[PDB]
Target: linalool dehydratase/isomerase
Amino acid sequence: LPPGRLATTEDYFAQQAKQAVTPDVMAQLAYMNYIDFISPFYSRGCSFEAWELKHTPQRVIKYSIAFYAYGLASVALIDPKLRALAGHDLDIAVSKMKCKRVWGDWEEDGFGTDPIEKENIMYKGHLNLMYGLYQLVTGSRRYEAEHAHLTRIIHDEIAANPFAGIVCEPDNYFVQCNSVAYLSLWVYDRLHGTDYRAATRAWLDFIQKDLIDPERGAFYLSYHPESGAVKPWISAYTTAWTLAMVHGMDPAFSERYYPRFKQTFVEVYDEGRKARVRETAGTDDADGGVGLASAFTLLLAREMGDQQLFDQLLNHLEPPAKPSIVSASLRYEHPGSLLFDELLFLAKVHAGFGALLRMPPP
Amino acid sequence: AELPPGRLATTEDYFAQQAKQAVTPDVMAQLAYMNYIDFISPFYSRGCSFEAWELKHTPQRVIKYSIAFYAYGLASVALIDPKLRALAGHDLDIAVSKMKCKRVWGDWEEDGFGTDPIEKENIMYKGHLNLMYGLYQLVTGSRRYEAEHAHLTRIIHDEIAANPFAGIVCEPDNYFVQCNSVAYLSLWVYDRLHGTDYRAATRAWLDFIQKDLIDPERGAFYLSYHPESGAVKPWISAYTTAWTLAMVHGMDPAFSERYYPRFKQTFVEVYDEGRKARVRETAGTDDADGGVGLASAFTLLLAREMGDQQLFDQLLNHLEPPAKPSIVSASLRYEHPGSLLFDELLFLAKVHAGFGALLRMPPP
Amino acid sequence: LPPGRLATTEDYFAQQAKQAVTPDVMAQLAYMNYIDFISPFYSRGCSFEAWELKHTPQRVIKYSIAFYAYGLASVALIDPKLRALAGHDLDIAVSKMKCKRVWGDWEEDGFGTDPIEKENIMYKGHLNLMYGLYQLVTGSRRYEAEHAHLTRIIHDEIAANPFAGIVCEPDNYFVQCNSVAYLSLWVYDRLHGTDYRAATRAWLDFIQKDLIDPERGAFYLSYHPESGAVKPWISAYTTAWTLAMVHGMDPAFSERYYPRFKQTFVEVYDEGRKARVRETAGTDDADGGVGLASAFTLLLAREMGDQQLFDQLLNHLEPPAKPSIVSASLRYEHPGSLLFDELLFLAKVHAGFGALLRMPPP
Amino acid sequence: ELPPGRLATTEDYFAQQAKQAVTPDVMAQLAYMNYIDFISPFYSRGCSFEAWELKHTPQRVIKYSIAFYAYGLASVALIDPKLRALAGHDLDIAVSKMKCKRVWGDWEEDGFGTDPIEKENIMYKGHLNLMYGLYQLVTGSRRYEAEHAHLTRIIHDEIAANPFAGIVCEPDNYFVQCNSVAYLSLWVYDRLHGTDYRAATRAWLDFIQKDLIDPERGAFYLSYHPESGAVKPWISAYTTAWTLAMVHGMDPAFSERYYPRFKQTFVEVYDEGRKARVRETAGTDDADGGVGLASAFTLLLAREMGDQQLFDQLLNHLEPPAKPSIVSASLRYEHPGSLLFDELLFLAKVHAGFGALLRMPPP
Amino acid sequence: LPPGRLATTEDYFAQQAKQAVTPDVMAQLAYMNYIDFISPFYSRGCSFEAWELKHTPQRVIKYSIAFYAYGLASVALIDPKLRALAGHDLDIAVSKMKCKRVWGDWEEDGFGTDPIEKENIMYKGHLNLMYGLYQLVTGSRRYEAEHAHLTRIIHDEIAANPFAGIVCEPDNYFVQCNSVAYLSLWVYDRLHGTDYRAATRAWLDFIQKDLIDPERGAFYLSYHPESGAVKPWISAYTTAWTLAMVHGMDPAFSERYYPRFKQTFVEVYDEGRKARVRETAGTDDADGGVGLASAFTLLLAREMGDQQLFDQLLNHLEPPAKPSIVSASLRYEHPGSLLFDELLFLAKVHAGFGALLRMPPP
Ligand SMILES: CC(C)=CCC/C(C)=C/CO
Ligand SMILES: CC(C)=CCC/C(C)=C/CO
Ligand SMILES: CC(C)=CCC/C(C)=C/CO
Ligand SMILES: CC(C)=CCC/C(C)=C/CO
Ligand SMILES: CC(C)=CCC/C(C)=C/CO
Model:
């Protein structure tokens, strides 16, 4: 256990088999749930104190909520004694996701007044996936009408487009964004016996054409239908997120590219004890751009069962953030990026996107 | 010891107030802070002005509690010293009036829950308001708020009757035992004033919170319960337990007597060769006063409610001296309050006559 | 003349006999009238730059204007060459008093939309007294209709109440507040031959029951009719203000209590050269509470002809405030309280409230 | 010789009209006024005030900043025929900016009314009317002629209606400076149109010489207030300097009578006769009290009266401490000593006399 | 390669022939496109985070967008592999140009509510040129209706004016402004076979009368039709911009004046290694006024094939701005003027305005 580490990689990977989260994961759930008013999952109301205190930019809140929700879904699978709590937190997550503070950028930017409108898949992909995970975890049909509506809408946009997929916002196509939307269709299908996921094959064929560099195992940053343009930089954070979710739908896809991804972006250092991830090609700098390459690669390592890389990345990410546990609750004095506690929480618990799809009922 | 530095009066003096029919000079000085200076004192005006709270930096969500806990302390002041009863009644009138201002309840609307704070399931607000209505009337005899009191009491009772679980949610899908304890205690107060039996629901509630929401070995309640999912948050909470046991002791003394010693074994750290004490907020930590930071302060109230002079003295030796009290121009100020609701809770604990004694308050 | 003093006490007390204000009082009038835009009596408009620059809290502005006006009424008596100027300033005073910035707390607090409504005697006592003093000084009937209306309203509230007097705001009765209101009735009577002042005897009998401690010569802070409560602290600032105004209506009342008041509250120090006033009993601290005990005692000493105490108090109050005269205008670098230049101005010129009532016409 | 911290000699400023050229430092001030995109004050006719935001001009002062610039521009036109078109362009902008709510809106914010042309807002409308006139004298353009005729008629009607001679600057506040502007605007209208609105001048000059002036001291009292009859009992140098300067264009003998007394009363010569500064009122040794503009308006007055010695003295006091620099042929002051600082120094440097503006040859 | 320089002048000038941008130009395109939310060309929405982070004043945003767009048009010509990206960025440029944040000064100033009105050529000149360049680069007819409308409007204002050209805003005529508007007509003509550019000869004859000093090779600052005034100062930034654009329409015009311009304004220093430009006559100070003389002269040097001057100017401009390349993206720690990264970007890639007109189709 190096300084600034709270539990072993062996312990994180064993949680599901031990049917128990680690004490530091429990302490993160406490940060999430414990203190009146200021904890993020205190209330279903449209209050965002936790996010104001962390200085989360408004455009990032929707992602904070989503990534917490994805971690909570794995908490439910890990420990049956925590499943009701996870379900409660997911209920709040969905409820908060619907507040104008979360989606309102859509209106402030002049795109429209309803966030469910065409082509806002940034928001509505995550929301749809969250609707599905909430239902898988709890059995509650509270959001089932909305879930069915949003699923139909997403499917209809896919059907209507000459390219395979949907734009994340107007004329901007991102593979990560799509991966969420498609994964939400798999979740709906699991709940309802439908075949919305049929579209997945065409999408996976398409993203393997101009959107990926197959030698390097890396996706380009974005695609823009109106002009045909593919932005000419490859992106590690983009690729890590996309491969992780894709591995739940078509495991062979991600298994093909994962080793090349690592050759391309991952720098191992400190005599093999640590790793950090370059955000693009043609640089030695780690964690450029949005600063999330290492954190999303941590999730990916977990999704691929790569314990060595997980340990290396977490040795780089966690200690400088200066974790402490005060009154059985986890705080980081110096988080190194946006979405920091969210992504470390997620990666520590992540049971695999395929396992979430196959979650036994309650 | 007897008077350590940073202490203003002995525990023996606080406990003797009711028998001496007089508050201590420091309690008088706290009433001065509350009443003296034009505009900026908290109980200066019935209007919707909150300067005292702005100056203390009270967060808006906490104002309702500040007002309530001041009111509970005022109710005991009335019992202590008949010469101060009219003043207490005046301050309670102002308390109730301020409680009704949008600055106090408006979070309900800002959060998107609704436009009327008396609506279903806002018992965080309306529990305290109902209890205050009742205490105002017990202290003064005034029927000024009787109509509103009857209405709010009927509403609360109806929500209890309608729920499959025993009790009411503090806000949607969040059930807190402390919150319920206030609501139920308000029903006892209404019944005292009017001969009704709204308090009949108490037995079912006490059975429910015991079967399910307490760890009986540790003498501690879990943090919250959430009906839609069935979830009980898996941490025990000292502040939650201290507040709940204190109010419960006024309705069913045996309940609190059963758990109080275990509560102390679980949460209370005695230190400094028995002279001091501080309270851990949850299990599995050595840190004192985590979470909302009110474990010690609510335990101080509990100790007073249970007649535990030793623990009271220990807690107050921990809480009061670091806050650096001073009396300037016969008025009490704390240079370094250690928590939210600091002067409110210390005031309350210093005067608290017992929730049962408030129920049995003689008329004026 | 100690350092930080501008004229002798003998000079202040001699102004009326010399028919001239002191140069420092002239310099205060200059502060009040000279500089474009920023002087307080520059304009009848609803502009409050002078008060913004002094940092006057909004609740205090109504008192600032009133106390300036009371000093101006004495300026008019002192020096016939300045009476037109004083009258002009009083006109502006009355006009500014009617602006929403001054009275608008009544609305912000939720009490009502019209400040003349029942039970806002904090505002309407001072306004009614000002209306009267304006007319005594000038002979103008500009405000006579409003004056008659407000006088009738105040009289009706007194008649309607089971206790003698009116509340300053709902359920809060203050003797100072009443003293202003009753003094406004004396002024109306002087201008119109009416007997609104008949109510005074009942009020003076009442305030001498629970409201005063007759041994200590001090009023309690406030009275609250709904509950019957009298706040159990005595207040120097309250008593000093009330005795001063009462001395204009019933001189014997104030003569009875004045010496006891001084025993109770006034601390003489610095080998008899200085004095300061304790705000309540059971403390050695001076000028606690609102911080106006010494300043109102200065006014009281002037009202009672107590030259020694006046000199002592002013030796305490003025020098630390660091007066200077620049371009024949008076500035205090370090005013020690709210209402600082207002109350020192007033006390320096105050001819006695009785003398104001007996002001010869123009 | 050039005294320390000065940009040009007094002899050079006074010679501009005869040389038919402004001095280089005046050119540099015109550059500050006109050169840089967006932030120069005379860049745009739009309701943008960046130049004033950068200088920290209080909003109540903007109307005066614009007016005093315009008066200087009118003299630039007379000085150098090659700059007359530019001056006329700047005056067009001046008038246009003067009509923006940012400039006049205090009238509304103070609760007096919603229209600044109303009644009794002669602080604003005096200057506006004078500017309308000067714009037309400089350019020949009839762009604002309708508005000019309307505002002139209004001003004349208020004078006719008042029992006292003149108009109040705002309600119940009468200021002689304010009136001087209004009356001067009537002379300008009469010059353009052959009318006799100026007939009211004599009655006004007789009136201001009664309670409003101390004739021994050559100084006006601060203000007069009709409703009460009050005259504020302090004399004011800035008030007097401004009033005498404008009055000299209508009745030169009036200002010649009082000017020497004014100087005895207020002007302190110091530094072995090289410098001067002006006391704002009586009974003080302090210079430039009150609004802080006594010296600056006296500088204008000295120029109006041909008093080269006093001009030189005042400018030796005013300019060097303000630390002028010329960067990229444009003038900035690092430490302006008062409000309206660059405006009044500009004006005084170019001022051809208010009478000379009235008799400006056409283009 | 001096310190603070990223590539040689020989390398910038060779880009078109090598069919590749320099690595530092790639890094600038990364700053423009890479990071989610905060990059300037991330989104077509009305969000201006990139400009908020750079502290761009609102009145300058329209020019920032325009000058970026002009550089993008040359990127398209340089590297066919980047042409789709450039087209995408131009689409966004146009879309952002239409947001009220960009044009709203027109309304705030009281001129009107529609920025296409009459006489707002500062905005609509650039918008029209951008419409054209977008279509040249992409072949997309997305804006063709608006382009045709705006071109007609501009042409109609030229036809209606007694002087040759249009005012940039009411009564303010600027030659730079006109040069943009006229160049937009050439672009429209190239796309549609029309002859809107016929008006150019009259305009070029007119600007050579009072508007230029032909000995000094320099334009006066502005012209004002209502009064006939020409502001009597010459301006280097004005002249550099105008001559650069004019060289695309009538090369001989700019060839005539360019050497005189350099004599008048350009100071070579540091033993010939550097140059800086005076903004007006009668000063030794460089980069006065708006502070853009050197930057626009850098563009002009590029337009005229003057490699020596380009190298000299860039040795003055770039090193003090402290460029760094972090994660393959270009940032300047200390930009020396407004529009700094925009104008250096433009000048580094600029292929010539004539070459843009003759851009081969896609
Ligand atoms: C999380 C951050 C800082 C960027 C995400 C980029 C994007 C548009 C994803 C779509 O779901
Ligand atoms: C007063 C504080 C800081 C916490 C208590 C909040 C709560 C859920 C009360 C239930 O009546
Ligand atoms: C002036 C200050 C600080 C308090 C005045 C108190 C009051 C209620 C007076 C009524 O005329
Ligand atoms: C320019 C400044 C500071 C004062 C002049 C104020 C006034 C009453 C003008 C009358 O036209
Ligand atoms: C870009 C900057 C600081 C000024 C531009 C001046 C102008 C009116 C151009 C018209 O296209």
